């Protein structure tokens, strides 16, 4: 068995060095005719396969990325490091590490899970947290959709929690979209409107870049 | 009384020079009260630099040097290390006692930013055959030395017995901390995942365990 | 040159306490000997100054009706006593040297004693062995509740190059050790004053496997000869001398039509090496397809790929 | 570099059902063509190799064919296991190069969105911007369009649409649409509408509200 | 089972001579003795039969007045004394055993002694090596000039896998022996009576050469790898301890620029075992030139030659 | 140094097995890529390659002999053997054993003398020797060439001689002629013409394959 | 006086039946007579055979049996083996002696032919110090038991000192024998190459030496 | 197999002059081939291999180039050793194959033949045949021809020829011609004669004899 474990920086300024960690449990970097591979996605599904190092110590890279790239490890820690010199948002990606060399023709027989990479301009930004209340009455003993909108925020990720996880289901937290350099998302939760106006309906809105915790509360609108 | 005054922090880049005064209530530092200069590195270490106004201990590098500018006594550092980076304090003579000043603190620039090295440590049977649990997370190595520590079990805990020490300088200028979560050993027992997150210059490092 | 202080000191208000400072590695009687007070997120404090050649005490007007200075010669060691103490009084106190012959001045300081006064009730440490939990050697010891204030950690191996770190305390009164190891047991021991509570905790988990080379050789045409027999060798070095298997495959499907040689080669002490050979036929290599020897040991696969080159 | 092309880029089934996805050369890989799979939140797992190499661990139900610069992947009786994302990758030559993917969703009954729709809070009106938000929680199948309308009249800039993985345990989707005015924009209007077309519905589900309190 | 008599004995005219037949393997008393006389050229004639058990001596009528026969029970010896000896009494004489109870029949015969009667003068042999003259172990020795008439030869060596061959002499009274060898000495001893003209002649050409086992093996690419390192490998076995000297050649032009790693890998008493590496570039094993390692040892060239598998 | 000699029957008759011996002497028939090959001329001085064995022992043959050759070795005695099966008269030849792989790219090292060996349905015959000598007179202290005809024998060779080896110089022996199955050969000594009236001028003829020995002298005609 | 006639030779094939008579100048062969059947072998080798009449000796393959045919002894070999090739005396018993036959020839035949094994010695340096010389050309394995020895010096020798043996069968029923050039120290030094040929069923081997 | 061809078959050359042999091969044998010497009375001995590398004892005035299907081989400066038999092998394939061979003769002044006739003896006419004798003795160049006539007439049946090899001692060649008749045919006739055409005379020598005693 063997273990690839991916560690990165999550976000990096454009002209700087990034540089990627895979942590190996199992087996050596140096046992006999082992191969580590660094390989990336794409936002467009586009897989790359950069580069790799070999157990014999040896690198072979993309022609691609020649000049740019250097792969290098550390056997006693048992770990293998990807360096990219001047990054571009061109080179925001999934960074995934590899074994192959178990089977004879050149096939990755392990993976990590992999580590996201931005590559922006931009800086650590706290979220501002609006409420999501309906715009009309409510029908006494209706379902109610309340949510939360986390808007302008960097990097990733944000934890949205609804009453501190006592509400636990009719959640939808939707996936953050990237404008200009910022995200934004939104939650929601559906509860009886009976519960609305007798019990306190608040997002609890945790963004650990920026060491911010929020909590919002669902006030019914006039 | 007489009282010794020196400056609250100095700042120099590795490779400058930088001059650290030492002033006396009762006018004008002379030889007579040996003007006496002493270096305090992290684990409460002191190091005897300069004697006199200007005679250096054996043992002393050469770029520090002492003497006498207007009417305060003087440390110059003539090519700064890293190495230097430490509380100097001054203390002068008076006829029957020795008086110390409120150092200075000399911080060196140009030392590279470092991310923490984070390590997660289940509790121990012994403790879980009481009542309670602590999971230790240890943070060490990281530059600047602010940091802030997160835990996640059940999602997003809210206070549960998350507890952090402040950051505290390292022989190597790097600084380190630790952070406990107390939790019931029945709150043990029913959760599984358990993780640990550290926040540094904007970046998080996360270690976790299990079972 | 050394100076040796307790690390740290209990007393109850109004008693008195008595610090020691014991010396090693210089002329004891060549030295003066200084007394400094400082207190948490304070200044330094000068007390007294004792010459060990004689009797040349001397103190700051402040301390004097609180502190006594002595030198014992025979053990090497300077005393300082305080008297009438209270919580004004809870400070670490450091011995130093001062050269008195030709120039004035200071090099060498002692580690200093933490003197707590207090008629507060005691707290005895809780030592708790940190699990290292796999997926790493990271040791450490927890020291849960514990009270007058101060505690202090040292550490036991079989030898090692070994880096320890004590960390700070919680305003909880809460303390971790932990140890990194660049195979064999770890322990740690804590103290707490009042008197010598002395607790320690004990903790491995060692690991052993061999890991062998692996040589895979070819054995190809003799420009002489019309017909050359294909031989591939599978060089196994350095295994463990009782435990090595090897399978061969073609195309990463297993062989076992052929039969293949393997022969012990070496033995040197616990360790081994042998060499396993497998006969292909010169279609079979002129084919470019790839061959194997798969070396399991210690329930570890080890490989080894060839195949004639290409193009 | 060869260049791998694979279709179909999105497969809908039930299980018991047979699947075939295809991976076309730029240029003859032999026979040295990939198959990998992954499941949601699980790294990526290698299927078959060489063509038609099953590792020890893939199950008889997966099977590949092919050579030269045409090789497909079969999947027969499928377990709800197998509904993820797989892909191809040459392993002829140097640099190793892979395909688009495919990704294998399981079918489920058709369900109409739940459309809910939200004006802006005071607190961003505060600062000058607003948010008009809609949700269409829990439909299926995925295809759906939203239209916004401000007074009857549409609306296609500052529009932001976000859509869910499908549901691990309804197999649904669920997706967000935000429209974002400036305060001086957004104050001009009365009536806000979003309009959710849909499978399940000839016409359109449409969610308003009024600006007037 | 043995009827040991000698070789050749001689007589001067009218004189008288005593044969001798000693027994070996068999019960002496339970056997009777005859005795049968065979001149060159002509058949066999009946002498006389005697049973060692008691005193049973029958003559024929024609060697009654000639022969006596005796037998010897303590020395197991059967005895033919010759009278009134003259040249029609130079002959063979056999003794052979029969058995008499229950059926009569022949078995074991003797090899003969040669009785030759003359006046005539002695010439004693003349013993010359004969040296094989390389090109080849077949030793020999050459018997040049003797007479009465017989002559005897026997070989001595240190053990070995020999065959010897005894030649029939010239009537210019010649002889030769001579001896195939399958390392040691060898020496030829030669009788000729009358009396024991034992001579004795020695010779010896040794040989010492150890022939090792030459392996070429070759690293060949590694499918997972881009770029692999070609390196060769003459493995030398079982050569001369401190004898052994590698040189290498690409297309039959000896390397000079590149340096080879030759190192020892056994050793076995005064054997050794011995491995050259060297590296070739991807393009020179490709390019389908030959290589070769030259091992020089003891004088020898042995040679080892590869090249990629063409077509 | 190593050296080849080769060893045959030196006539053979056809249908039967032609066996023919290489002796080596330096070297190993084992030594390390040594190949001992059998190589053959024909009278019209074309080069046949017959085939090897290998230091292995391994054995290849050319596809025109195959089915018909068999090359065997004695590796104590440091000989190597060719068999050749139902010989006709086209395998009449002068074979030769040769040695390669010193050098790296199949040529041959080392070669032997060669054995002749001729293919005839033809037996053992001893020679006729007549007489050459003038058939006019000889001009008075002029020199004279006579001679002896050693004609109808089989196989070869035949020594020829003047006087037992007095008249060594002014000699001419010609190489035999193959008619039928029967060799014909002539030999000349020149002498004065005073010294063959009144000395012997005899020629000795040897065929040891008959133990022939004749001696003709040479007499004036009339 | 009694004699004892046998037949001079016999020739049998190997597998086949061969029988071998011996009869009495007194009449009848009886059993009274004891006829004796031995067999010689090359360098003297006299093997008891049959006693009696019919009587086999212990040792003895069971081929060879004994009888009375006619007025005559018999010795029957049913199933000749190539190595009964020998000389085979019959004997019998007259009152107070033994007179033996002429002995038979057998002969088997089969045998395929052989070429002679050659090896030539050159003279000693004892030898070369006396005033003669003396090479010598040994000969074995040779069948049929005929052969011709010629030598090269000069050319071709006429008389010098060629001398040689007459062949003598060896116990695998081979023939043997050796030739010998006796030449003077001084012709030795003079001459330098040598070379004897031996000639068998018209086939020469050809030995050859030097210095 | 590779087909080579020699050229020339004969050369006749002084020492110290240059000489050069080819080889064509019937298909490529890119540079392997090898060129061999072999002296009257001397086993072959291997001077060039691989198209252009000598042994290490072959003299540097002998060398070889060419590559694809034609090589030469080229020697300068000739020594009085270097006049022997010469012949090609390639060594690209298996079977080896070689060439015809050249025979490099060494050149003299010319010298007219010795002729002499000699009639068939009495010991071989009582056995019924009949055998004339005619040597042309110590010749050069080789080329000549001899015309055997009985009474005027010419015959070319029942006529042998010999040429002796290049004489190692006066570089010359001598040759016999034996004419073999019946008894009964040689009895027929009376002038019986041979005439030897050399370069070394315009008319040919003529020898004769008369059957009549
Ligand atoms: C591989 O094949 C070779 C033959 O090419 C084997 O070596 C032969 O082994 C036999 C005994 O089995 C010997 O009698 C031969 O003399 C050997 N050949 C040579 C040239 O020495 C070898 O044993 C085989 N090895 C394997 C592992 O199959
Ligand atoms: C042949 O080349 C290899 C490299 O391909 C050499 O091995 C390297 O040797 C150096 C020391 O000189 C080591 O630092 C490297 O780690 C080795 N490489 C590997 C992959 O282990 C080898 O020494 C060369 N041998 C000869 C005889 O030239
Ligand atoms: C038990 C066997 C463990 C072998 C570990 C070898 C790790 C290093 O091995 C080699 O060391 C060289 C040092 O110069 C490096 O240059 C090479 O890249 C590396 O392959
Ligand atoms: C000092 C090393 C000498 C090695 C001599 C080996 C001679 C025989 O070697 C091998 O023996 C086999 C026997 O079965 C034969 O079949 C093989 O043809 C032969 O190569």
């Known amino acids: 068995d063997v273990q690839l474990q991916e560690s990165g920086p999550g976000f990096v300024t454009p002209s700087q060095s990034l540089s990627v960690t895979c942590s190996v449990t199992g087996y050596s970097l140096t046992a006999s005719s082992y191969f580590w591979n660094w390989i990336r996605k794409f936002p467009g599904n586009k897989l790359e396969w950069m580069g790799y190092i070999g157990y014999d110590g040896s690198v072979y890279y993309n022609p691609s990325l020649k000049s740019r790239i250097s792969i290098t490890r550390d056997t006693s820690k048992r770990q293998f490091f990807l360096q990219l010199k001047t990054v571009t948002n061109d080179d925001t990606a999934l960074y995934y590490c590899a074994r192959h060399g178990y089977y004879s023709s050149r096939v990755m027989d392990a993976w990590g899970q992999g580590t996201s990479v931005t590559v922006s301009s931009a800086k650590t930004t706290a979220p501002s947290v609006y409420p999501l209340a309906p715009g009309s009455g409510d029908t006494t003993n209706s379902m109610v959709t309340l949510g939360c909108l986390v808007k302008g925020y960097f990097p990733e990720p944000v934890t949205v929690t609804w009453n501190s996880g006592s509400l636990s289901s009719g959640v939808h937290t939707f996936p953050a979209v990237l404008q200009s350099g910022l995200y934004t998302l939104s939650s929601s939760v559906t509860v009886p409107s009976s519960t609305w106006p007798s019990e306190t309906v608040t997002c609890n809105v945790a963004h650990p870049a920026s060491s911010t915790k929020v909590d919002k509360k669902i006030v019914p609108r006039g | 009384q007489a009282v010794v005054t020196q400056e609250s922090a100095l700042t120099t880049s590795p490779g400058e020079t930088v001059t650290l005064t030492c002033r006396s209530s009762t006018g004008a530092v002379t030889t007579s009260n040996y003007a006496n200069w002493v270096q305090e590195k992290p684990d409460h270490l002191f190091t005897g630099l300069i004697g006199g106004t200007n005679n250096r201990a054996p043992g002393v590098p050469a770029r520090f040097s002492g003497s006498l500018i207007g009417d305060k006594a003087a440390l110059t550092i003539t090519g700064a290390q890293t190495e230097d980076e430490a509380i100097?304090?001054?203390?002068?003579?008076?006829?029957?006692?020795?008086?110390?000043?409120?150092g200075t603190k000399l911080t060196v620039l140009g030392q590279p930013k470092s991310s923490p090295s984070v390590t997660l440590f289940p509790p121990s049977s012994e403790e879980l055959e009481t009542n309670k649990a602590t999971l230790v997370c240890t943070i060490t190595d990281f530059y600047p030395g602010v940091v802030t520590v997160d835990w996640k079990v059940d999602g997003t805990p809210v206070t549960q017995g998350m507890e952090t020490t402040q950051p505290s300088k390292q022989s190597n200028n790097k600084y380190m901390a630790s952070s406990y979560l107390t939790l019931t050993a029945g709150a043990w027992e029913r959760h599984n995942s358990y993780s640990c997150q550290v926040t540094h210059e904007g970046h998080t490092v996360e270690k976790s365990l299990s079972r | 040159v050394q100076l040796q202080q307790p690390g740290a000191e209990l007393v109850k208000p109004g008693a008195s306490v008595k610090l020691s400072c014991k010396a090693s590695g210089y002329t004891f009687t060549s030295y003066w000997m200084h007394w400094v007070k400082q207190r948490p997120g304070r200044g330094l404090e000068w007390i007294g100054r004792i010459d060990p050649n004689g009797g040349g005490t001397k103190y700051n007007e402040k301390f004097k009706s609180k502190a006594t200075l002595t030198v014992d010669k025979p053990s090497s060691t300077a005393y300082m006593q305080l008297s009438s103490l209270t919580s004004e009084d809870s400070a670490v106190?450091?011995?130093?040297?001062?050269?008195?012959?030709?120039?004035?001045?200071?090099?060498?300081?002692?580690?200093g004693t933490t003197l707590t006064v207090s008629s507060a009730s005691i707290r005895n440490p809780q030592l708790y062995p940190l699990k290292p939990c796999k997926g790493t050697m990271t040791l450490g010891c927890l020291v849960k509740d514990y009270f007058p204030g101060p505690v202090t950690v040292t550490w036991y191996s079989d030898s090692l190059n070994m880096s320890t770190v004590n960390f700070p305390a919680l305003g909880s009164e809460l303390k971790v050790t932990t140890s990194q190891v660049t195979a064999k047991n770890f322990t740690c021991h804590v103290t707490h004053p009042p008197s010598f509570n002395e607790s320690r905790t004990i903790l491995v988990r060692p690991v052993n496997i061999t890991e062998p080379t692996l040589e895979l050789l070819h054995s190809s045409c003799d420009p002489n000869a019309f017909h050359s027999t294909i031989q591939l060798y599978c060089f196994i070095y350095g295994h463990i001398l009782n435990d090595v298997s090897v399978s061969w495959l073609m195309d990463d499907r297993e062989i076992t039509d052929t039969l293949a040689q393997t022969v012990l080669i070496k033995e040197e002490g616990k360790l081994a090496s042998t060499c396993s050979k497998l006969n292909i036929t010169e279609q079979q290599w002129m084919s470019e397809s790839t061959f194997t020897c798969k070396v399991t040991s210690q329930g570890v696969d080890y490989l080894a790929h060839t195949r004639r080159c290409p193009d | 570099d060869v260049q791998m092309n694979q279709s179909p880029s999105n497969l809908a089934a039930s299980p018991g059902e047979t699947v075939s996805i295809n991976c076309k050369a730029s240029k003859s890989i032999s026979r040295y063509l990939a198959w990998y799979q992954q499941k949601p939140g699980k790294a990526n797992k290698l299927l078959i190799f060489s063509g038609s190499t099953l590792q020890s661990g893939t199950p008889s139900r997966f099977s590949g064919s092919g050579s030269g610069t045409d090789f497909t992947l079969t999947i027969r009786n499928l377990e709800p296991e197998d509904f993820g994302l797989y892909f191809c990758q040459q392993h002829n030559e140097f640099p190793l190069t892979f395909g688009s993917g495919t990704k294998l969703e399981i079918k489920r009954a058709d369900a109409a969105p739940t459309v809910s729709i939200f004006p802006p809070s005071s607190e961003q009106l505060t600062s000058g911007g607003a948010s008009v938000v809609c949700f269409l929680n829990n439909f299926y199948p995925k295809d759906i369009n939203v239209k916004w309308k401000i007074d009857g009249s549409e609306r296609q800039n500052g529009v932001l649409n976000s859509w869910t993985d499908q549901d691990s345990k309804d197999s649904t989707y669920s997706m967000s649409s935000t429209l974002t005015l400036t305060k001086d924009e957004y104050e001009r209007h009365n009536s806000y509408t979003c309009e959710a077309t849909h499978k399940t519905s000839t016409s359109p589900i449409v969610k308003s509200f009024n600006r007037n309190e | 089972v043995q009827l040991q008599q000698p070789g050749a004995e001689l007589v001067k005219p009218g004189a008288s001579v005593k044969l001798s037949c000693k027994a070996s393997g068999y019960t002496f008393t339970s056997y009777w003795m005859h005795w049968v006389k065979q001149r060159p050229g002509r058949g066999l004639e009946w002498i006389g039969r005697i049973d060692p058990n008691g005193g049973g001596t029958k003559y024929n009528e024609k060697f009654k007045s000639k022969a006596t026969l005796t037998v010897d029970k303590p020395s197991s010896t059967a005895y033919m004394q010759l009278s009134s000896l003259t040249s029609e009494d130079s002959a063979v004489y056999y003794c052979?055993?029969?058995?008499?109870?229950?059926?009569?029949?022949?078995?074991?015969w003797g090899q003969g002694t040669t009785l030759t009667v003359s006046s005539a003068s002695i010439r004693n042999p003349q013993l010359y090596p004969l040296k094989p003259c390389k090109g080849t172990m077949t030793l020999g020795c050459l018997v040049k000039d003797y007479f009465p008439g017989p002559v005897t030869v026997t070989w001595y060596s240190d053990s070995l896998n020999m065959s010897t061959v005894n030649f029939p002499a010239l009537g210019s009274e010649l002889k030769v022996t001579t001896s195939q060898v399958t390392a040691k000495n060898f020496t030829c001893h030669v009788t000729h009576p009358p009396s024991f003209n034992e001579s004795r002649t020695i010779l010896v050409r040794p040989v010492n050469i150890t022939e090792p086992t030459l392996e070429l093996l070759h690293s060949s690419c590694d499918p997972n790898a881009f770029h692999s390192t070609i390196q060769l490998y003459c493995f030398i076995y079982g050569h001369i301890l401190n004898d052994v000297s590698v040189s290498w050649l690409m297309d039959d032009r000896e390397i000079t620029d590149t340096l080879a790693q030759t190192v020892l890998i056994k050793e076995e008493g005064k054997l050794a075992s011995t491995c050259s590496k060297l590296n070739i570039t991807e393009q020179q094993w490709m390019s389908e030139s030959t290589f070769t390692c030259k091992v020089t040892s003891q004088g020898v060239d042995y040679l080892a030659h590869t090249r990629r598998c063409p077509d | 140094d190593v050296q080849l000699q080769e060893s045959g029957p030196g006539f053979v008759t056809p249908s039967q097995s032609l066996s023919v011996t290489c002796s080596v002497t330096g070297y190993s028939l084992t030594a390390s890529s040594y190949f001992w090959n059998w190589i053959r001329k024909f009278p019209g001085n074309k080069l046949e390659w017959m085939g090897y064995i290998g230091y292995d022992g391994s054995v290849y043959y050319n596809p025109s002999l195959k089915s018909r050759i068999s090359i065997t070795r004695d590796t104590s005695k440091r000989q190597f053997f060719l068999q050749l099966k139902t010989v006709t008269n086209d395998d009449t030849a002068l074979y030769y054993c040769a040695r390669h792989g010193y050098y790296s790219s199949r040529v041959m090292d080392a070669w032997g003398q060669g054995t002749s060996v001729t293919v005839s349905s033809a037996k053992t015959t001893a020679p006729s020797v007549y007489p050459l000598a003038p058939g006019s007179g000889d001009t008075t202290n002029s020199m004279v060439t006579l001679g002896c005809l050693v004609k109808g024998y089989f196989p070869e060779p035949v020594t020829v001689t003047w006087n037992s080896g007095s008249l060594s110089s002014g000699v001419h022996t010609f190489p035999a002629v193959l008619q039928s199955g029967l060799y014909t050969l002539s030999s000349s000594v020149t002498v004065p013409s005073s010294t063959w009236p009144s000395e012997t001028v005899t020629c000795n003829v040897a065929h040891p394959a008959s133990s022939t020995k004749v001696d003709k002298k040479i007499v004036p005609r009339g | 006086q009694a004699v004892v006639t046998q037949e001079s030779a016999l020739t049998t094939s190997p597998g086949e039946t061969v029988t071998l008579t011996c009869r009495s100048s007194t009449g009848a062969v009886t059993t009274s007579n004891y006829a004796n059947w031995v067999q010689e072998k090359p360098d003297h080798l006299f093997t008891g055979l049959i006693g009696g009449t019919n009587n086999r000796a212990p040792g003895v393959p069971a081929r060879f049996s004994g009888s009375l045919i006619g007025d005559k002894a018999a010795l029957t070999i049913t199933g000749a083996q190539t190595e009964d090739e020998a000389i085979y005396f019959c004997?019998?018993?007259?009152?107070?002696?033994?007179?033996f036959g002429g002995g038979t020839k057998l002969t088997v035949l089969g045998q395929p032919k052989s070429s002679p094994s050659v090896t030539l010695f050159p003279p000693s340096s004892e030898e070369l110090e006396t005033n003669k010389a003396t090479l010598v050309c040994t000969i074995t394995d040779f069948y049929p038991g005929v052969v011709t020895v010629d030598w090269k010096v000069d050319g071709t020798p006429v008389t010098q000192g060629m001398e040689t043996t007459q062949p003598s069968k060896q116990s695998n029923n081979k023939y043997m024998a050796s030739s010998y050039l006796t030449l003077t120290a001084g012709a030795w030094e003079r001459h330098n190459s040598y070379s004897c040929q031996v000639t068998h069923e018209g086939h020469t081997v050809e030995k050859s030496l030097s210095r | 197999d590779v087909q080579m061809n020699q050229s020339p078959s004969n050369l006749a050359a002084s020492p110290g002059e240059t000489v050069s042999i080819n080889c064509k091969a019937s298909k490529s044998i890119s540079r392997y081939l090898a060129w061999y010497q072999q002296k009257p009375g001397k086993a072959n001995k291997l001077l060039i291999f691989s198209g252009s590398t000598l042994q290490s004892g072959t003299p540097s005035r002998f060398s070889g180039s060419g590559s694809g299907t034609d090589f030469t081989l080229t020697i300068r400066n000739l020594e009085p050793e270097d006049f022997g038999l010469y012949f090609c092998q390639q060594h690209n394939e298996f079977p080896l194959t070689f060439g015809s061979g050249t025979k490099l003769e060494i050149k003299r002044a010319d010298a007219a033949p010795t002729v002499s006739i000699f009639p068939p003896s009495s010991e071989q006419l009582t056995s019924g045949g009949a055998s004339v004798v005619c040597f042309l003795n110590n010749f050069y160049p080789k080329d000549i021809n001899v015309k055997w006539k009985i009474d005027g007439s010419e015959r070319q049946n029942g006529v042998l020829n010999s040429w002796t090899d290049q004489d190692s001692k006066d570089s010359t060649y001598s040759m016999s011609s034996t004419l073999t008749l019946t008894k009964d045919e040689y009895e027929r006739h009376n002038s019986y004669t041979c005439e030897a055409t050399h370069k070394t005379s315009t008319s040919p020598i003529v020898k004769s004899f008369n059957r009549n005693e």
């Open positions: 004997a019998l018993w007259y009152s107070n002696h033994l007179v």
């Open positions: 052979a055993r029969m058995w008499y109870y229950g059926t009569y029949y022949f078995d074991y």
